[PDB]
């Protein structure tokens, strides 16, 4: 799935302009931008719902692409389960009962899966639609605001489920979405599209030098805490006057807290401050309107 020099306009309105895209051995790529920038357009070009993009869309047609664009697409007078079976048989390879069940129960749609779609709420339709896309057991999954109508728990479980699946199946996932907080849960990179061209890429697995975990201890504990962190981590900064030590950001404090406990040291305060995709977004786009 590669995009080379894609250009797309609607009359005089250029949406995409010489835009390139790939997956640099990444698996989960988020797509961020303001409304009117063209995220859906990019996805449609990749899906192949557009054939007037003046550029090269490199797709090994041997592979399957699953997707969800804008509002969910379902057959209203049929059950949820019906739709899953149909699409698995029709767009997918066949209907895999075990696979289907894992998705249904993981999403928690089970209680209404046998009810007709027209009786579904917007949220329910989206949970189903995501599952419909997944039923193709695709390699490329393209989702246009997949959690747009989901509740807090729905979003977490669905996104978590997909991440598990990208290893079960050799997948590559493109997620265009607001709720940067959801992208931050499941991502390994994100791209920011503004003014019809990619502007800033972010490598989630690299982060920045400033992403540090700060340990604060009593003055009498400082030297022995510094010894411990020097021997097991990289000290980026040392403020003995105030009792602070800075190391690269830690996701899980258990190793540090257990080791300090063996030394009879208990830190008063541990904090990590790393910039959010939200902050990145505003820095880039806020000036359009503001």
């Amino acid at each position: 799935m590669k995009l080379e020099h894609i250009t797309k306009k609607y009359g005089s309105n250029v949406v995409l302009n010489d835009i390139d895209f790939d997956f640099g051995d990444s698996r989960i790529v988020g797509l961020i931008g303001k409304n009117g920038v063209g995220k859906t357009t990019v996805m449609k070009v990749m899906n192949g719902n557009i054939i007037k993009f003046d550029g090269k869309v490199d797709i090994d047609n041997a592979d399957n692409i699953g997707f969800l664009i804008e509002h969910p697409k379902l057959y209203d007078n049929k059950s949820g389960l019906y739709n899953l079976k149909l699409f698995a048989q029709v767009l997918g390879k066949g209907f895999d009962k075990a696979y289907t069940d894992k998705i249904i129960d993981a999403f928690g749609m089970r209680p209404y899966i046998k009810k007709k779609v027209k009786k579904y709420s917007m949220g329910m339709k989206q949970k189903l639609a995501i599952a419909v896309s997944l039923m193709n057991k695709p390699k490329f999954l393209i989702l246009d605001e997949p959690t747009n109508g989901m509740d807090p728990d729905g979003s977490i479980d669905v996104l978590t489920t997909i991440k598990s699946l990208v290893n079960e199946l050799d997948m590559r996932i493109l997620i265009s979405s607001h709720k940067l907080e959801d992208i931050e849960l499941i991502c390994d990179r994100a791209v920011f599209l503004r003014d019809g061209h990619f502007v800033q890429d972010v490598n989630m697995e690299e982060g920045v030098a400033s992403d540090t975990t700060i340990v604060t201890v009593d003055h009498k504990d400082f030297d022995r805490t510094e010894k411990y962190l020097a021997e097991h981590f990289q000290l980026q900064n040392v403020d003995k006057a105030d009792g602070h030590l800075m190391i690269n950001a830690q996701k899980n404090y258990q190793v540090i807290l257990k080791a300090l406990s063996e030394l009879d040291i208990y830190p008063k305060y541990i904090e990590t401050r790393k910039s959010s995709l939200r902050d990145t977004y505003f820095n880039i786009n806020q000036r359009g309107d503001k």
Partner: protein
């Protein structure tokens, strides 16, 4: 490869499956059966006080008319279902699939036509079992199948192309009905009026809309060599156009 063919057929199976589950189908069948039985019972066996002997050919033609209309509406629904539910967007993602979509629908149209012809056959067989008269030739029923296949496939593919051209469904059902009921209306209303009346009337033999619609109420048919070719040629070109179009139309 067969994998491609399999996916195409799976879509066909679902459209036919739907036909056999909706209560509307069953209702429509019962309505046709009732109307035919009604004609047989009310006057075919009594108008001239015959010794209960009827003309199956009159029944045959009436049944055909009704089933072709119902059939055409089934065809239109088959065609427009994905536009209506918007599900078409999930199919037209690449050329292989886009083409397969047209193929699938073409197959479904053919199978619908076969189903309707089978219904027609059965209704008439029941009538023959029920009363007196010389039974119709098996081969007559067979030719009737050919008529159904051609009539419905011609209109189906034509309307399909329009459906894809406009991406509207209301006007497809409207055209299906309109075209069927306009030919027999307009012919005797004004064909005879212009100095070109005879020219126009003769011209209809070379226009599938006119001759296919007119034969919907005939007890039999015999297509002229031209008429036969023109109709079939029209089917082929519509099929081709549907493919060429779907391959290029953004969804």
């Amino acid at each position: 490869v067969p994998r491609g063919s399999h996916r195409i057929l799976n879509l066909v199976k679902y459209d036919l499956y739907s036909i056999f589950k909706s209560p509307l189908t069953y209702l429509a069948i019962l309505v046709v059966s009732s109307l035919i039985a009604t004609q047989s019972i009310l006057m075919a066996n009594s108008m001239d006080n015959p010794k209960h002997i009827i003309v199956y050919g009159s029944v045959f033609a009436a049944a055909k008319w009704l089933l072709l209309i119902i059939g055409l509406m089934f065809v239109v629904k088959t065609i427009t279902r994905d536009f209506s539910q918007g599900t078409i967007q999930l199919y037209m993602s690449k050329v292989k699939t886009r083409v397969g979509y047209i193929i699938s629908k073409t197959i479904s149209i053919i199978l619908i036509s076969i189903l309707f012809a089978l219904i027609h056959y059965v209704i008439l067989i029941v009538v023959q079992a029920s009363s007196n008269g010389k039974n119709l030739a098996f081969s007559k029923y067979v030719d009737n199948l050919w008529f159904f296949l051609i009539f419905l496939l011609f209109f189906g593919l034509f309307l399909f192309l329009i459906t894809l051209a406009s991406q509207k469904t209301a006007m497809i059902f409207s055209l299906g009905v309109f075209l069927v009921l306009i030919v027999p209306f307009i012919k005797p209303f004004i064909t005879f009026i212009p100095r070109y009346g005879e020219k126009v009337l003769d011209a209809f033999d070379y226009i599938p809309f006119a001759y296919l619609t007119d034969k919907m109420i005939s007890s039999n048919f015999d297509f002229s060599n031209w008429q036969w070719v023109i109709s079939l040629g029209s089917i082929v070109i519509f099929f081709i156009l549907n493919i060429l179009y779907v391959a290029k139309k953004d969804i």
